Amino acid sequence: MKLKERLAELIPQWRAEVAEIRKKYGNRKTMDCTIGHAYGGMRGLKALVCDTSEVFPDEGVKFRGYTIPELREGPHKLPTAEGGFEPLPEGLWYLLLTGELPTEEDVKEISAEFTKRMQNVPQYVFDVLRAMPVDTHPMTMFAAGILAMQRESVFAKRYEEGMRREEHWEAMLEDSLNMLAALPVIAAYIYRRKYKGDTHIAPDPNLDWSANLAHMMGFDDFEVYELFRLYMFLHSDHEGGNVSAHTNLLVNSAYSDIYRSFSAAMNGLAGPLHGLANQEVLRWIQMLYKKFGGVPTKEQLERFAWDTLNSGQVIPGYGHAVLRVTDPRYVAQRDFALKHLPDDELFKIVSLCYEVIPEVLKKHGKAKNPWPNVDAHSGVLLWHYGIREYDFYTVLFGVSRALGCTAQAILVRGYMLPIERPKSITTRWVKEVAESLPVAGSKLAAALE
Amino acid sequence: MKLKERLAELIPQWRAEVAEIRKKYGNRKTMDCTIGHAYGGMRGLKALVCDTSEVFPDEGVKFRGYTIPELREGPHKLPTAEGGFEPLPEGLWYLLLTGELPTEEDVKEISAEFTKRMQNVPQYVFDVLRAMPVDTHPMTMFAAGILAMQRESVFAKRYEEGMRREEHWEAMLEDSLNMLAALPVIAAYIYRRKYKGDTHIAPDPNLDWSANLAHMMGFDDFEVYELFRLYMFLHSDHEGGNVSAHTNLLVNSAYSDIYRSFSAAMNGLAGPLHGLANQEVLRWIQMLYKKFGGVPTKEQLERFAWDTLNSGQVIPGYGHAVLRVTDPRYVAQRDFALKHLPDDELFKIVSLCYEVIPEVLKKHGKAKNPWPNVDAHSGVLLWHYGIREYDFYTVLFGVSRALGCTAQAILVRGYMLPIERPKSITTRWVKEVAESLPVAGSKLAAAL
Ligand SMILES: CC(C)(COP(=O)(O)OP(=O)(O)OC[C@H]1O[C@@H](n2cnc3c(N)ncnc32)[C@H](O)[C@@H]1OP(=O)(O)O)[C@@H](O)C(=O)NCCC(=O)NCCS
Ligand SMILES: CC(C)(COP(=O)(O)OP(=O)(O)OC[C@H]1O[C@@H](n2cnc3c(N)ncnc32)[C@H](O)[C@@H]1OP(=O)(O)O)[C@@H](O)C(=O)NCCC(=O)NCCS
Ligand SMILES: O=C([O-])CC(=O)C(=O)O
Numbered sequence A: 001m002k003l004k005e006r007l008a009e010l011i012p013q014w015r016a017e018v019a020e021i022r023k024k025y026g027n028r029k030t031m032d033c034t035i036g037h038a039y040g041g042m043r044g045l046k047a048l049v050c051d052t053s054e055v056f057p058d059e060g061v062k063f064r065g066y067t068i069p070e071l072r073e074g075p076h077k078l079p080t081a082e083g084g085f086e087p088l089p090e091g092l093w094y095l096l097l098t099g100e101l102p103t104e105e106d107v108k109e110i111s112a113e114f115t116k117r118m119q120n121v122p123q124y125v126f127d128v129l130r131a132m133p134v135d136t137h138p139m140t141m142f143a144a145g146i147l148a149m150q151r152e153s154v155f156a157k158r159y160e161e162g163m164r165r166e167e168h169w170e171a172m173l174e175d176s177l178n179m180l181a182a183l184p185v186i187a188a189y190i191y192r193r194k195y196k197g198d199t200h201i202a203p204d205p206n207l208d209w210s211a212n213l214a215h216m217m218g219f220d221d222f223e224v225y226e227l228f229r230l231y232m233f234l235h236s237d238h239e240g241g242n243v244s245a246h247t248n249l250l251v252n253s254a255y256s257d258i259y260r261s262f263s264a265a266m267n268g269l270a271g272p273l274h275g276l277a278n279q280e281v282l283r284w285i286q287m288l289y290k291k292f293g294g295v296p297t298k299e300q301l302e303r304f305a306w307d308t309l310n311s312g313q314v315i316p317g318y319g320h321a322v323l324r325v326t327d328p329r330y331v332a333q334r335d336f337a338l339k340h341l342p343d344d345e346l347f348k349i350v351s352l353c354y355e356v357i358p359e360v361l362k363k364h365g366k367a368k369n370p371w372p373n374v375d376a377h378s379g380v381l382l383w384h385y386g387i388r389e390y391d392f393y394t395v396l397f398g399v400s401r402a403l404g405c406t407a408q409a410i411l412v413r414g415y416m417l418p419i420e421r422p423k424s425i426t427t428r429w430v431k432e433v434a435e436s437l438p439v440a441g442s443k444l445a446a447a448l449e
Numbered sequence B: 001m002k003l004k005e006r007l008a009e010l011i012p013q014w015r016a017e018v019a020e021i022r023k024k025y026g027n028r029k030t031m032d033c034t035i036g037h038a039y040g041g042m043r044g045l046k047a048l049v050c051d052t053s054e055v056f057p058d059e060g061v062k063f064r065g066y067t068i069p070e071l072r073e074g075p076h077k078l079p080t081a082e083g084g085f086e087p088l089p090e091g092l093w094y095l096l097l098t099g100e101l102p103t104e105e106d107v108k109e110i111s112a113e114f115t116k117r118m119q120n121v122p123q124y125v126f127d128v129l130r131a132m133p134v135d136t137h138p139m140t141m142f143a144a145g146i147l148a149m150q151r152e153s154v155f156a157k158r159y160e161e162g163m164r165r166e167e168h169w170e171a172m173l174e175d176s177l178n179m180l181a182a183l184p185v186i187a188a189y190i191y192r193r194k195y196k197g198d199t200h201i202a203p204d205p206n207l208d209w210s211a212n213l214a215h216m217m218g219f220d221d222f223e224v225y226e227l228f229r230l231y232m233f234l235h236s237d238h239e240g241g242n243v244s245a246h247t248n249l250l251v252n253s254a255y256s257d258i259y260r261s262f263s264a265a266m267n268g269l270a271g272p273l274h275g276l277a278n279q280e281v282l283r284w285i286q287m288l289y290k291k292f293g294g295v296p297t298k299e300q301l302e303r304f305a306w307d308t309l310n311s312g313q314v315i316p317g318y319g320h321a322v323l324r325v326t327d328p329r330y331v332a333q334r335d336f337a338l339k340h341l342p343d344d345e346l347f348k349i350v351s352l353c354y355e356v357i358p359e360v361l362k363k364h365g366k367a368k369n370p371w372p373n374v375d376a377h378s379g380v381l382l383w384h385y386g387i388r389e390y391d392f393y394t395v396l397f398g399v400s401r402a403l404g405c406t407a408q409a410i411l412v413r414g415y416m417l418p419i420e421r422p423k424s425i426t427t428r429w430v431k432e433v434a435e436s437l438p439v440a441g442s443k444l445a446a447a448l
């Protein structure tokens, strides 16, 4: 497989480069660490490495240095399905791993690997899934199904047999191919059992990875296939620092295989502070529709927005802290909606918010960002095509985020980064010593530097 | 429950104190963050809070300010079982949660809570365990059974219904009691199904928590109950920064319940670099025994150690990522062994290592820490009493570590700390700006 031969050349080089960097720049200061970081969830602390993606405040997320527009339409467009427009996640995965753009044949090899492997989900995984009570939350089922498949881990098997550190990335890759192929099968099983009367649809060996998820959930529509391709592409990766990506890296750092690291990550994604944002946006849009007996006018939405902001509250999906521009993942979703469901009533509200809410936020004066993120837009797209089971939205997010998690996990085992092991501090120590400590950026801090 | 009444007073104060510290001292600097931290797994970076325990590089772990000798032997001896010497882990949990030494009655109340709730493991958790192929690694089975029981989460349910942030710690405590009571039942189930012919032994309502695990595994000797009590005490907690404790805090930070956060932690503990050291040491000890037809002499062992290091190998059970002297968890185990199995051949090798190996690792000069850690001593104790299933040793570790993880998760939810969300950097950026950055503790750093 091309992906593998290429990595066999790039990874030895990256490994050497990283060893040199740690040697010659290890002592370079990036910032001050504060009491505030320790009690404030490490916010802003430059404590991890991720090379798959990178957020620029003035551009949004890039994938190995390419913008979403370059990959989606521009001059570096990734391969699509036959007759499709939307980029295939398979090709994006090639890019995240290698840092190089795939050829059509590269993508097809990855698609065939996925299609083949998607037939290899162990029967006992479904036994595990069926032993869980059907009212179990779908993210609990998703994580459990993944973890049960740890029995099939090549990394775990090869590690116990004795393999060189240099082979770690090979085993991580094999495991990632198996796990990624399995994810849509597990996800669809959960969907069909909980919400569609426990009737089950087999993978179509002539569909790509994203489309097969839609197929197996029971949604056979070209538009739905295209939405799922775009959705999986957009949500694939967002740096290393979010709870689920970080959980993945942390468990990975102890040499736990991808079934263990990624199921752990899904337990983090299942958290209400990490995995529900898209659902909350959608329920808000729906609350506006019902409040206004239909699409609100520009004046009604303005007033409702002022009422919300003046009463200390925020508007879901808008005004997050980092970007100074619209999330490029939002823009691609809007472009999809304009093309494919412009008259859908909930979309009309999301569209009006894109006009109105940024104008209101500029005027209100708090947010150095008046613009939306990805979660502002995704829910109405799912809901339009009949995917209405809110709890399950987090599972779709999880399937997508597996692309970036698997890439990250393969790369860091290629780099041979060590176990993650920060130092914790006690409140006792803090209370004793805090007076003694300089204010960060102060003249005293400069003195004690 | 005394525990909960005590928390119902202490947590509101601690919460207020933490809000004060964040407002007043948030901007105080503790150290420089470097490029090396980001590529070096955050080693030394003061990035997390943990009030349950603290590891002093030059003294070892203290639990809420108490040393292991203080709590096991010394002037602050925790409660023991009737006729026992070893401290009950139930009282250690009380200490971790409250910061106060428990009475006998406090401990009995926690024991009874575990006893009662041990009868309440859902039938479907066993169905989940039986659906996994019996040759599945035991730590995969353990994590999966814990995760399946997430359906019974009171935190999840109350959060969905709408609860005030101040009720968090209470739902975490209820969940922790349930989960802790379930862990020995799940662990024993795994043990019996994999290794003892799939015959199952019910919990004993009159045993304490540790003893009940031993009983349900099929061991009823007093000395084994005492070993389990000591083992569960020693492995209970070791700051917030180790992979399992940290994974628990990270997932808990997103408001995921203890079944999710602790099952995530167990997937980390299952990793070779976190949870395998016990077994590696025992196999190494057994390799020596077989190599020398018995206990080696000082000179044989000395020579072996040198040959080992100069052949590029590591001596298992020596060194630590933070510890810098003899692990007091090692010393407690040695004491148990001198008392209870002084003539055990494998123990005699462990003992001899204690005399010889430090000297060697010092002169070799690569190990930052030349002394034994907890893992140098645990395997020979288990092995002596007939617990021989190497892979399962990590599950025993996990059951113990749940005591620290649950204490930490309750506390951090009481304090109301936010979501853990550091910043990742790229190699591209490092290459672009590294030369222009100041060296940590330099003149240019001072100017900037
Ligand atoms: C003020 C602002 C600029 C920063 O947001 P933030 O609240 O610091 O964001 P986080 O999600 O990282 O942290 C949430 C914190 O808000 C706290 N918070 C929210 N409302 C609160 C209230 N009424 N009282 C106390 N704390 C409150 C939470 O409890 C949590 O803990 P902390 O205050 O102890 O730190 C905000 O307007 C904003 O833009 N937030 C979005 C930023 C963001 O994280 N974007 C996501 C990018 S993917
Ligand atoms: C625990 C351990 C992983 C910590 O590693 P660490 O923090 O990187 O250790 P140090 O800072 O002392 O490493 C410095 C050097 O000493 C070596 N070293 C450390 N402990 C050693 C040991 N017991 N035997 C041989 N060499 C050892 C390291 O390999 C390293 O050499 P290198 O720079 O060529 O790689 C390590 O001491 C070890 O491998 N111990 C054996 C297994 C074990 O008992 N683990 C349980 C830990 S609770
Ligand atoms: O997962 C996400 O949406 C991104 C995120 O929270 C972060 O970078 O902290």
Ligand SMILES: O=C([O-])CC(=O)C(=O)O
Pocket (backbone or CB within 6 Å): A421, B237, B238, B241, B242, B243, B321
């Ligand atoms: O603390 C560590 O780094 C590893 C360890 O000893 C433990 O978790 O008990």
